[PDB]
Amino acid sequence: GGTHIDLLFHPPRAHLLTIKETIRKMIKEARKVIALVMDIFTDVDIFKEIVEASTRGVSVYILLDESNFNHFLNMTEKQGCSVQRLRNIRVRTVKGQDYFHGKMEQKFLLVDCQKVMYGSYSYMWSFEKAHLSMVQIITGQLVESFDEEFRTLYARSCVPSSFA
Amino acid sequence: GGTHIDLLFHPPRAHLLTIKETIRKMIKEARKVIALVMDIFTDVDIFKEIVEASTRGVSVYILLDESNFNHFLNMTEKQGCSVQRLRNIRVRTVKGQDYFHGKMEQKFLLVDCQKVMYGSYSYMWSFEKAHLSMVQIITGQLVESFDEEFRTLYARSCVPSSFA
Numbered sequence A, B: 001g002g003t004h005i006d007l008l009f010h011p012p013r014a015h016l017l018t019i020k021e022t023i024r025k026m027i028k029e030a031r032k033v034i035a036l037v038m039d040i041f042t043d044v045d046i047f048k049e050i051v052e053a054s055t056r057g058v059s060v061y062i063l064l065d066e067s068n069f070n071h072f073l074n075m076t077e078k079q080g081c082s083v084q085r086l087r088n089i090r091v092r093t094v095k096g097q098d099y100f101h102g103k104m105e106q107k108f109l110l111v112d113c114q115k116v117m118y119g120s121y122s123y124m125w126s127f128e129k130a131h132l133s134m135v136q137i138i139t140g141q142l143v144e145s146f147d148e149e150f151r152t153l154y155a156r157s158c159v160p161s162s163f164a
Ligand SMILES: O=C(N1CCCCC1)N1CCCCC1
Pocket: A033, A034, A035, A061, A110, A113, A146, A147, A148, A150, A151, A154
């Protein structure tokens, strides 16, 4: 059992789907579990796909950088889609050492312990329209290391202050 | 000819060197060529290592995000180490589509067409002291795809306004 990696770019280069389309496809095809680590999450289309997955019964765990968490909350509020009342979604925050906010500068999407998207694409409109980015689509043995890193992060994460 | 990937974390997890130490080691061991793509470059220790490599005769190509380029310039000025007068170093800028600055949100270090460090670690004091990050150390076939992506970026890069 080896590892397979494909690269995708924004803008696209020698592949048929954009990175956003690929994210949405990965989430749409999720059967069991989605584990997301993200620095900034404001993209409504991606959020919708994740909400939809959770309503099909997929367990969703999301870890967000604490210092940008309010941006995700604002988006969920605008959408009328409180994450606290969605029973298959858990959202927790992760921070670094303050000195200026210390941040979780890691992001990746893991689906079904089978496929990881790892790269520089953040879930914001600006990554669809403005920024250059790249990711890897990873399958096989290395996915297990992303599973373990997700668990490690999850263990260092907090309940967001807002949730009661 | 396959690909080998090791993961490193900051803070470290089950490896002896920090990511910064590993960056410095990679640069120290460079024999022929360093190709760096970086969003923000203010770390003086890393800069020093790169300057030193160039004085040994290693060709250095650096692509920086245009919107943060002034931070690198400021650092090189503070250090009294003008990059324009170092003959083995070329520095060019890359930007995305403006709307607010469109940015090159990609970073990686490629050394000798042999080893790539790819991940979320930016060359700034805050990644040594404050932020959580991770990278991959990549060798083997996938390095070739980073070579091609570097060339693609280089082809879309500009001479920084300051250089004349
Ligand atoms: O089931 C999981 N997974 C983590 C690894 C990838 C997906 C499966 N979790 C994460 C949160 C703590 C325990 C449950």
